[PDB]
Design a protein around this ligand. Structure first.
Ligand SMILES: CCCCCCCCCCCCCCCCCC(=O)O
Ligand SMILES: CCCCCCCCCCCCCC(=O)O
Lengths: 55, 293, 48, 96, 250, 250, 250
């Protein structure tokens, strides 16, 4: 499950820091987070899909 | 051990949200289509409730729309000209470190209000004829309040504590990692206020919007020489943000920028959307209708 | 956008109004292949 | 959800470009407005956050979402057919 | 329930706001205002929390909405920096932090129409438009009146670019709410303290801009009441002041 | 619940009809449309079920309601026999069967008034009125235009006798619903396939007549919008075509 | 058995093809036509499957084979894009997918001789031969008639290079079958949906080219029937249309 576009995994000698400072390390892009609600649904009363929103 | 750790380092595929099969819904009471934009929330309605959908097990990858991926790409942030010919025979230049100089990088970074990142800086240096001779150059980072050099050979280039980089134009471009350097907990492209107390009654309100939490000193660049080389050197500085966290998204700038550190726009307002003849005009020929029904 | 029926108002009510369209993307929306945008332009490589 | 600039016409200026005008019609089945729904294309989608983020990428996929908020008086009533035509065809000339 | 109730009551301190057409309340970034935690706190001075004295609804500015009105904006806490005990605490102390509860009240009859977008823009850096003629026009830097309008607020000159060179269409990215005279008559935005620093000077720095822009213009038939006011009411929440000294006004 | 909700959403195929004044939905004879069972099926050809292609809301006819308008009628499936993929399936095949979801949309302001009876009459045999003068007037047999109006529908000449010699007062025996501009603005009649035969020719035989008759005339005061349209939207349900051959139009 | 039977019957929908000289049936790439699986499906619209209506043998084109005939080709689904319910479904919908069952019928007496290679070429890009004289001859791009012949098919001008600059000798790499008037009189090629995309426009894009080329010329002695026809019969299989809109013809 990579971006290789074919069957194969190989061996992964990557993401190695060679310096005593950790900010010298390669871009930290192992983790992806998708929490859209803080921007798309910030209202107090959560509205169900089915129900007409204002009553 | 740490071997298992290396195995799980390739970026894994996170897929997009799947569609579920849906049928007709002929009942009163259930109204997914009806929303209330007034509440301030985006529509919660899904494809499956508005039309009859099939089951799709979506395998499209979302890993690339990340603030890491979006910003982890080196872009031009400065061009320092080390003039050593004609009227300008200084053979050194002190360039204020700011990333708001060039549109392509500025506009990307101003998507956020606050950002905390480490950056990687690359110095592509060459002559007017794009030639890279064996010419030695000193790149010295001068943190805010470190003395700035006033001459080609001044004491400030001893660098007992200032970090400097010696490289020949001949060598592949110098690169260094820089940490998150800021008194504040994050950087801040928009500061709505003044850095000093006062009444701010100046015919030119320069001080407005200028937070020194962002101003991160200068880079002093010289040709390590005794006398005028008679050659100007161009230093393209490339910044690749990394380890990036961003807060409070903002609208992408529409108007062309005018100055470096101030959002200011020409009184000619360029419309966000390219205009067309009428509100019922679309530019698509399509095909020949079978029943003209 | 077509009129399914007409826009009907009583007397002493404005007979012209507005609709505000708000565009977004759904949960299955995905992008690919980061590239530089067309949407902003400075004059040359050496500008503010 | 961010506002589409559907009224992106020669004459219209400023905030007026963000309003689709509607009115009592003497004739049934006249076309109120029309816009293409490809975020990349120069047009009403340029004014949306989705349209501006798309132009930072080459390829896009998935369902889009248009929300229409009416801002007539409480006393105003009406019905609107909002149709989406898949790629083959031109802009429909009649409601049928 | 799964639906927002139309009728709503907002009680902070010794003030209560009742509204019968609330289109729900926006909680910005899905976070409630709270006192600075020990871990985020940098400054060792014990911070005063005046509670009810400062945490209450202040009705500061009422504006007359017209058919050609272009919009108004305020800067928080600048708008309140001289009004009530809050004002005094803000002048007497250096460091400042609070979230707020915005509430814009605009009623009209069922025979008026129009839409106001009410949006809270964090770090609203007011721009100055320079005339095409001269590259560095004197109006390249906005004067103090435009950056800090105070209680009376300031009229937008170019609301399309939100006087900041960013499209109003995309302003819906910030915590926003509409006042459709068709549906509702009030907009409530609870906003937590948003800043890179845990405490900031109330006087020098404005955490948020409060912008009310008429998107759909106000229209009505001859005979209806022409005067339709828009009122801003703001309640600071979890206010915390520190670094006591001589009172300084701006 | 024990009460019909005012607000209702009807989604068939790639079409959705939203209404905020639905006075409930009539299910004719308390039976849902369904595919012909094996036991009732007489014809051995495997029947094509195009599903979403044919089963979706078609908005065919809009009519202007006036103070003296007498009413309109359509014949199903005649009304749809030339529109969309349904039309093509109906021309290409001999045998036909489906129920339908009628939805008549008529909005007006709270200052208009009037009542439309919307009624589905199975086997609506249009009569022809013969003038008293001659016993066998040429207009004893209604011409093809009156029996099969198609998409545009036909104006009633004598809506009191529903152009069939049967009193309109007793038309409420058939599946019906009212559009009182006071209460509602839409009428939905789901109708199952009603015929003595399990499958019939879409072209030759009309299973149902769709009649919209203004009982209480449309009245309003000077200043209101005179143009008040009535729109017919029909969605075939559980459509099944069989006996494929050369496409025949009527 | 371990041998292909000479006599064979092919029944799809309401059509049956019987042949007493079938030289076996080719299943292209050893894969049967099937409906798009959930995993490969990209488009969220529910896809209509008309089954028997569209999935049946259509006899479209008959051609007269002569001693100097050079060959004919058709483009699928272009050949069927205007014939029967398939044609209508293909015009009314955007996305399209189906495999097909080809069957080329050519009988002659035991005293005629000749060989036809019948080959299905996926993505048959018709080339245009430019005369040696001019480097960019106007006939560098083949006109619409050559790329999309429709029902009537198109005569090869250079069958040796299959009008595409690729040798006919190596055309046997594609799914093919011979009609040796010595042995057989029919060629059947079942072909699954072959495309980089799960669904494509029937009108714009042609998945396969159907080429019948006489390798060994037709020869016979004076007295035999000179008129020897070659008939193309095609049955779409597991047809699936999606994205319903206004009918578009090419
Ligand atoms: C010798 C070279 C060493 C590299 C040192 C690089 C130091 C860079 C500081 C960090 C850069 C990010 C902050 C940019 C903020 C400036 C924006 C502005 O206020 O105009
Ligand atoms: C130099 C030695 C590096 C070893 C790195 C780990 C390799 C593990 C073998 C399997 C390949 C990784 C992906 C997987 O687990 O399938």
């Amino acid at each position: 499950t990579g971006n290789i576009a074919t069957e194969g995994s190989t061996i992964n000698f990557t993401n190695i820091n060679y310096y005593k400072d950790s900010y010298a390390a390669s871009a930290s892009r192992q983790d992806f987070t998708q929490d859209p609600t803080k921007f798309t649904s910030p209202v107090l009363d959560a509205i169900k899909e089915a129900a007409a929103p204002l009553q | 051990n740490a071997v298992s750790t290396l195995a799980d380092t390739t970026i894994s595929r996170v897929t997009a949200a799947n569609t579920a099969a849906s049928s007709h819904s002929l009942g009163t009471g259930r109204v997914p289509a009806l929303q209330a934009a007034e509440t301030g929330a985006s529509s919660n309605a899904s494809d499956e409730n508005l039309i009859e959908t099939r089951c799709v097990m979506n395998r499209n990858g979302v890993n690339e729309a990340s603030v890491e991926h979006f910003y982890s790409r080196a872009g031009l942030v400065g061009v320092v000209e080390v003039k050593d010919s004609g009227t300008s025979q200084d053979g050194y230049t002190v360039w204020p470190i700011d990333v708001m100089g060039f549109v392509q990088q500025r506009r990307k970074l101003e998507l956020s209000t606050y950002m905390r990142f480490d950056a990687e800086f690359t110095f592509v240096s060459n002559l007017n004829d794009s030639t890279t001779p064996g010419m030695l150059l000193q790149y010295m980072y001068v943190p805010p309040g470190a003395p700035k050099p006033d001459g080609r050979k001044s004491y400030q280039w001893q660098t007992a504590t200032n970090p400097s980089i010696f490289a020949k134009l001949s060598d592949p471009p110098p690169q260094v990692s820089v940490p998150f350097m800021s008194p504040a907990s994050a950087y801040q492209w928009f500061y709505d206020g003044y850095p000093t107390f006062g009444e701010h009654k100046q015919a030119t309100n320069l001080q407005y919007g200028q937070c020194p939490n962002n101003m991160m000193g200068h880079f002093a660049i010289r040709t390590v020489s005794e006398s005028t080389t008679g050659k100007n050197v161009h230093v393209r500085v490339y910044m690749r943000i990394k380890h990036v966290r961003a807060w409070v998204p903002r609208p992408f700038r529409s108007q062309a920028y005018m100055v470096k550190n101030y959002p200011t726009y020409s009184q000619t307002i360029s419309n966000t959307a390219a205009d067309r003849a009428s509100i019922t005009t679309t530019d698509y020929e399509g095909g020949v209708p079978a029943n003209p029904f | 956008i077509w009129y399914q029926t007409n826009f009907v108002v009583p007397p002493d009510t404005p007979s012209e109004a507005n609709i505000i369209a708000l565009g977004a993307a759904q949960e299955n929306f995905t992008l690919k292949l980061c590239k530089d945008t067309d949407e902003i332009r400075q004059t040359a490589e050496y500008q503010n | 959800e961010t506002i589409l600039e559907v009224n992106n016409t020669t004459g219209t200026t400023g905030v007026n470009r963000l309003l689709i005008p509607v009115r009592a019609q003497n004739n049934v089945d006249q076309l109120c407005a029309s816009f293409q729904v490809d975020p990349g294309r120069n047009g009403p989608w340029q004014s949306t956050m989705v349209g501006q983020i798309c132009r930072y990428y080459t390829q896009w996929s998935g369902s889009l979402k248009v929300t229409f908020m009416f801002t007539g008086s409480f006393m105003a009533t009406g019905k609107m057919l909002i149709a989406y035509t898949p790629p083959g065809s031109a802009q429909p000339t009649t409601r049928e | 329930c799964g639906y927002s109730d139309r009728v709503a009551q907002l009680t902070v301190g010794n003030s209560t706001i009742t509204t019968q057409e609330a289109a729900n309340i926006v909680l910005s970034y899905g976070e409630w205002p709270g006192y600075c935690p020990s871990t985020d706190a940098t400054a060792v001075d014990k911070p005063t929390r005046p509670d009810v004295s400062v945490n209450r609804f202040y009705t500061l500015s009422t504006k007359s909405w017209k058919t050609e009105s272009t919009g108004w904006y305020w800067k928080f806490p600048d708008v309140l920096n001289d009004t009530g005990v809050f004002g005094q605490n803000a002048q007497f102390h250096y460091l400042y932090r609070s979230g707020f509860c915005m509430h814009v009240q605009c009623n009209a009859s069922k025979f008026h129409q129009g839409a106001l977008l009410v949006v809270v823009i964090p770090e609203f850096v007011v721009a100055a438009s320079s005339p095409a003629t001269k590259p560095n026009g004197q109006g390249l830097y906005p004067d103090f009146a435009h950056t800090n309008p105070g209680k009376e607020g300031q009229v937008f000159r170019d609301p399309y670019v939100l006087d900041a060179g960013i499209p109003l269409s995309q302003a819906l990215v910030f915590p926003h709410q509409w006042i459709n005279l068709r549906t509702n008559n009030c907009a409530t935005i609870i906003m937590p303290y948003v800043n890179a620093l845990p405490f900031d000077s109330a006087l020098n720095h404005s955490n948020f801009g409060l912008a009310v822009i008429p998107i759909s213009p106000l229209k009505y038939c001859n005979g209806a009441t022409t005067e339709v006011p828009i009122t801003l009411t703001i309640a600071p929440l979890n206010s915390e002041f520190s670094g006591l000294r001589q009172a300084i006004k701006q």
